[PDB]
């Protein structure tokens, strides 16, 4: 019973793994792909000034 319980958790995790891939393909579609480059830009501005 414990063994299959662990197996179900692993199965859930790989199911949620392919859902992560699906979410990644969605993210890279959005012009959040464009807009977040601005976020990275300002973050790097803050970061590198903190260097």
């Amino acid at each position: 019973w414990v063994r299959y319980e662990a197996s179900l958790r692993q199965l859930e995790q790989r199911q949620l793994a392919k859902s992560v891939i699906s979410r990644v393909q969605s993210e890279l579609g959005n012009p959040k792909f464009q807009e977040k480059v601005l976020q990275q830009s300002i973050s790097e501005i803050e970061q590198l000034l903190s260097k």
Binding site: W1, V2, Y4, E5, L8
Partner: protein, 58 residues
């Protein structure tokens, strides 16, 4: 039952073990029939003993 999530079987076998915790009765009960074999044996024992004691001195 602090790692199983597919529960409701730990209480089942807990109860099955603690239920049949009284296991079937002791098998001390041959001591009348076992005693009888000893009686037969004793008859033979005494026969041998008395005979050979007599014969030795003879």
């Amino acid at each position: 039952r602090s790692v199983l999530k597919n529960t409701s079987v730990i209480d089942k076998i807990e109860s099955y073990v603690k239920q049949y915790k009284p296991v079937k009765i002791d098998a001390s009960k041959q001591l009348q029939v076992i005693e009888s074999f000893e009686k037969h044996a004793m008859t033979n024992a005494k026969e041998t003993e008395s005979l050979v004691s007599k014969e030795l001195k003879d």
